[PDB]
Design a protein around this ligand. Structure first.
Ligand SMILES: NC(=O)c1ccc[n+]([C@@H]2O[C@H](COP(=O)([O-])OP(=O)(O)OC[C@H]3O[C@@H](n4cnc5c(N)ncnc54)[C@H](O)[C@@H]3O)[C@@H](O)[C@H]2O)c1
Ligand SMILES: NC(=O)c1ccc[n+]([C@@H]2O[C@H](COP(=O)([O-])OP(=O)(O)OC[C@H]3O[C@@H](n4cnc5c(N)ncnc54)[C@H](O)[C@@H]3O)[C@@H](O)[C@H]2O)c1
Ligand SMILES: NC(=O)c1ccc[n+]([C@@H]2O[C@H](COP(=O)([O-])OP(=O)(O)OC[C@H]3O[C@@H](n4cnc5c(N)ncnc54)[C@H](O)[C@@H]3O)[C@@H](O)[C@H]2O)c1
Ligand SMILES: O=C(O)c1cccc(C(=O)O)n1
Ligand SMILES: O=C(O)c1cccc(C(=O)O)n1
Ligand SMILES: O=C(O)c1cccc(C(=O)O)n1
Lengths: 267, 266, 260, 266
C-alpha cells in the first residue's frame, strides 16, 4: 500500500488531497505538512478536515516524518516544492508535483533532480485536460499554420499565478506540435496600442474571479470560421483523485520525469 | 478541361454564394443555374443575381434543358429537388455535389444506391474546420465516451427548416461510430415534460434557431467534476461555398461512388 | 440578530442552510428539525443545538423558519408560525393549486417569504430579461438554453420556464402562446414570436441558463450559472434576515432584494 | 436629407459606411476621404463599394469638399479624427465619431470642441451594446459590491487598440453605477505572480484573432454563482447602420457632446 505525505495540508488542494487519499483503498494518509508559522501545525489531519481522527499530525517539516511515507503529493508554492524535491533526493522518496508558477530555471532544476528521483509533474491532474492536450496537437497540425491561436483561462480570485500552468501547458503542446518554442511566440499581455497581431503569436488572456475551479479554451481562428476546444473543471476532487492515482502509479517506479500522459497511458 | 458547374437553386442563400465562389475559382466555370419552376428569378442572367456584370447564362426552370452545358451539379436545395437532380445525373452521366440536409433514412439509402453508378460528393458541412472536428470527436469519444454523458448543441439562423442540423447529426454519427454504436439507437432529439433521469448511453441534441447565425456546433463530453467541449463556428457562408466548389473540382472525372469531404481533402 | 430554525436540517438544502446561516454574521442557527423517524434527531447541528423531531418543542429559541422540505411538512410549519407568531421562508416546491391558496390565506396573518428560486443572481436575471425584452423583444428571436445534471427529471427547468414567463409578460404575452419546446425533423421556418427552449442534460452540472435575444447582425445573451447549491441557501438566509420584524404578508425575492 | 462625408472610405468601416449611407433613403453619400498617400484617392466611391457609380471621388482632404457635406462619419485613427473635428469647428459642420483608442488628453480636447460643434461619440453604434450598458448598471447596483467583476472581449487580428473602446465603456458604466472611477479599479494585464485578486478590481482580458467582428462579456462572480452579460456583433453593417442613424439624428442639432443613448433615447 502506498503511504502518502500531503504537503500543505490546510490548503485548498491539500484538504482535497487528504480526503482523496483517505478514500482510495490502495493508499494511506501517512503525513501532512504546513508552513512553519501556520496556525494548523500540531493538529490531527482528521480534525482540520473535521472528518474524525487519524493517528497523524500536521508537521512543520516533512523531514521529521520521513520514515512514515513513500510519496509526497505537493500542491504548494514553488520554493516549498523545491525543498520537498531536495528532501526526496536526500532520503530516496518520490514526489507528485501539482504546483504551478515555476520559473524557467526552476523547471530545469526539476528535470535535473528527476534523473535521480521518481517525479510526476503536470499542470493539471484531470483526465479531460490530458485528452485536451492531445486534441490540441491534432488541431495545431491541421490548422495552426493558417490560423490565429489564442488561449483563454478563468480561475478563482485566490489564484496567485497567471496565466495558469495548464494554459501554458496548452501553449507548449500547440507550439511543440508546430515545431516552435512557446517563448518565441507567446504574448501574455495586450495593453494600449499593440499594432496589428503578428501571424505566429499565441495570445493569452486571463480571468480571475469568484470561485471558478478552472476553465480553459484554446481557439484556432481562420477567416470565416473558428474552432474552440474547452475544458471546465467543476470540483477540485477531480484533480485530487488524479494526483492520488499518480502517487499510486509512481510507487516503486524507477526515477525519471513522468507526466499524467505516462500515468494514464495517453501518449 | 475546366469543370463546368451547374448551380442548383441559384437564388438561394447558398446558391448565390456558390455562383460567386465558382466564378472566382479559376479552375471552374459557372455554366448553368436552376430555380423552382414557379420562381420569380427564372429567365434572369446569373450575373444580375450577384451584380457581377453579366455572364452569358440564364437561370433555368429545369437543368435537363441545359444538360450539355455542364459536368457537375452543386446542389444545396431541398431533399426532393436533390433526388431529381440525382436522377438527372444517372440518366445523363453527370456528377453531383450535395450540400442539402434533412434527408430521411430511406432517402439517404436511395442516395447510396445511385452513388454506385454516379460520382457523388455528399457532406453535411463543406468547411475545413468541421471536418477536423469530426476527427477530434472520434479521439474524444474513444477516450471519454464510455464513462461520459455526450451532448450536442447547435445554433442556426431563423430560416433553417431542418432540426437538428445535418452537421450535428454527422457529429453524432462520428461519435457513435467510434464507440461501435449506431446513432439511431442512442439519439434523443427532444426533451419535454417529465423525461425521468438521463440514460447512460444517450446522445442528446439541443437546437437553437435564431437570427442570422451562420452555424455553431458544440459537442460536450461531461463527467462528474469535469467536462470537455469541442466547438465549431462558421461566420461566412463563403466558407461552405468555397469548399463545395473545391469538391466539384475534385469530383470531376472521378469514378462513380459515394465520396465525403474527408475524401476530397484527405 | 435573527434566530433561524432550519426545517429538514439533514437534507440537501438543510445542510447548506445550516452552513449559510452560520456563516452569515447577522444570523444565528438556533434550531433544526427532521422527520420524527429520522436518524439525525438528537444529534448536534455540528455534524449548542440538537436536531429536534418537532419545531414546536423549540419555539422559544427562534424567530424565522427556513423551510425547504415537503409540501405537507411546510404546511405544518406554516400552522406553527400562525399559532406562535413566527415567520417562514418557504423554498419548498411542488404545491398544488389549493395548497398555494392556503398559503395565501395564512400569509394575511404570518410574515411569509416564498419564491421558486432564492439565488440572488437568477432573481436579478429575471429583471434584466424584462428590460431586454422591452427594448429588443419585438424585433428579435428569443431563445432560452439550459443545462443540468444527469439526474434532473423535468425539462425544461422551472427556472427556464420562469425566464420565459418574465420575457413573455414584459411583452404583454402568455408564454404558452409562444413557447416551442422541441424541434425535430422538418420544422419549417421559425415563427417571429416563438420562444424556443433547448435543454442539455449532462454530468453533475448544477445549473446554467441563458436567454438569447438575436437580431440580424448582433445578439445579446444573458446567462446565469450556479456552481454550488449554497447560492440558494445564501439567498434564503438573506430572505430570513430581511423578513425578521416585518409585518405579516406574502413576500417574494423581488421584495427582499428591492428589485422594483 | 443629410449629406454625409465618410472619412477613411477604403477602410473596413468606411466601406460599410458608404454602403449603409447609400441604402438609407434619408441620407446621401456626398463625400469620402482617405490617407493622402493612399492608392484609392481619385477613385469613385461606387467603384470602391463595387456598387455602381456615384458622382463622387475619394479625396485626400475633406477641406476640399466642405461645401458638399453636412456631417462627417469618422471611423479612422485618433489623429485623423482630431483633424476632422477641427475642420468641423472651422466650417460649422457636425460629426459622428466611431474611432477608439483616444488618450485621456485627446478625449478632453473632444469635450472642448463639442461645446461649439455638434458631436456624436460612442465606442459602439449597435443597439445591443447600448442596451447592455443599461443592463450592466442594474447588475452592478445589485451585485457589484459583493462580486468580482471581469470584462472579456475578442476582436479580429487587425484591431490596433486594447482593450476595446466598448470594453472600457462597459467598465465605465459599471464603475459609475457603483460611484467609482474606472481608472482607480481597472486591471489591464495579469502576468507572472499577481498575488490574490483585490476585492474592487475590474479585470480586463483581451483576445485578438481571425476576422472576429466583436464579442464582449461582463461577468459578475460570487461564491457559488455567476452572472454573465454578453454581446456578439456578427456583421459590421450593424455599426454602420447605427452610425448613419446617428448622422441623420445629429443633422440640425445644436452643438453638444452626444452619445448613442441620446440618439436612441434609452
Ligand atoms: N496541476 C494541478 O492539477 C493543480 C490543481 C490545483 C492547483 N494547482 C496548483 O497548486 C498550487 C496550490 O493551489 P491551492 O489553491 O491549493 O493553493 P493554496 O494557497 O490554497 O494552498 C497552498 C498551501 O501550501 C501551503 N504551503 C506554502 N508554503 C509551504 C511550506 N513551505 N511548507 C508547507 N506548506 C506550505 C500553504 O500554507 C497552503 O496551505 C497552486 O500553484 C495551484 O496553481 C495545481
Ligand atoms: N453542407 C453544408 O455545408 C451546407 C451549407 C449551407 C446549407 N446547407 C443545406 O443546404 C440547404 C439549403 O440551405 P439554403 O439557405 O441555401 O436554403 P434557401 O432556402 O436559401 O435556398 C435553397 C434554394 O433551393 C431552391 N429550390 C428548391 N427546390 C428546387 C427545385 N426543385 N429546383 C430548383 N431550385 C429549387 C429554392 O427556391 C431556394 O432558392 C439546406 O438543406 C441546408 O441545411 C448545407
Ligand atoms: N464605434 C464603433 O462602433 C466602431 C466600430 C468599428 C470600428 N471602430 C473603430 O474605428 C477605427 C478604425 O476602424 P477600422 O476597423 O475600419 O480601421 P481600418 O484601418 O480598416 O480603417 C481605417 C481607415 O482610416 C483611414 N485613414 C487614416 N488616416 C487618415 C487620414 N488622415 N485621412 C483620411 N483617412 C485616413 C485609413 O487609411 C484606413 O483605411 C478603430 O479605432 C476602431 O476601433 C469603431
Ligand atoms: O494550471 C493551473 O495553474 C491550475 C490548475 C488547477 C487549479 C489551479 C488553481 O486552482 O490555482 N491552477
Ligand atoms: O449541417 C447543416 O445542417 C447545415 C450546415 C451549414 C448550414 C446550414 C444552413 O444554413 O441551413 N445547415
Ligand atoms: O470598441 C471598439 O473599440 C470597437 C467596437 C467595434 C468594432 C471595433 C473594431 O472592429 O476595431 N472596435
Amino acid at each position: 500500500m502506498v503511504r502518502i505525505a500531503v504537503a500543505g495540508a490546510a490548503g485548498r488542494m491539500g484538504r482535497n488531497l487528504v480526503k482523496a487519499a483517505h478514500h482510495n483503498p490502495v493508499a494511506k494518509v501517512a503525513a501532512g505538512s504546513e508552513r512553519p508559522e501556520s496556525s494548523l501545525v500540531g493538529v490531527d489531519l482528521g480534525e482540520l478536515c473535521g472528518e474524525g481522527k487519524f493517528d497523524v499530525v500536521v508537521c512543520d517539516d516533512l523531514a521529521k516524518q520521513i520514515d512514515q511515507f513513500d510519496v509526497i503529493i505537493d500542491f504548494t508554492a514553488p520554493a516549498s516544492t523545491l525543498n520537498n524535491l531536495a528532501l526526496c533526493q536526500q532520503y530516496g522518496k518520490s514526489i507528485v508535483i501539482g504546483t504551478t508558477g515555476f520559473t524557467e530555471e526552476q523547471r530545469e532544476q526539476i528535470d535535473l533532480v528527476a534523473q535521480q528521483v521518481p517525479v510526476v509533474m503536470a499542470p493539471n491532474y484531470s483526465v479531460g485536460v490530458n485528452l485536451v492536450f492531445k486534441l490540441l496537437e491534432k488541431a495545431a497540425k491541421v490548422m495552426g499554420d493558417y490560423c490565429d491561436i489564442e488561449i483563454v483561462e478563468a480561475h478563482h480570485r485566490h489564484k496567485v499565478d497567471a496565466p495558469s500552468g495548464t494554459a501554458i501547458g496548452m501553449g507548449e503542446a500547440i507550439a511543440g506540435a508546430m515545431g516552435n518554442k512557446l517563448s518565441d511566440v507567446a504574448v501574455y499581455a495586450r495593453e494600449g496600442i499593440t499594432g496589428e497581431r503578428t501571424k505566429d503569436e499565441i495570445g493569452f488572456a486571463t480571468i480571475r474571479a469568484g470561485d471558478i475551479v478552472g476553465e480553459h479554451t484554446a481557439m484556432f481562428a481562420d477567416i470565416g470560421e473558428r474552432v474552440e476546444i474547452t475544458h471546465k473543471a467543476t470540483d477540485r476532487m477531480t484533480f485530487a483523485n488524479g494526483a492520488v492515482k499518480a502517487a499510486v502509479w509512481l510507487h516503486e517506479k524507477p526515477a525519471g520525469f513522468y507526466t499524467m500522459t505516462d500515468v494514464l497511458g495517453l501518449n
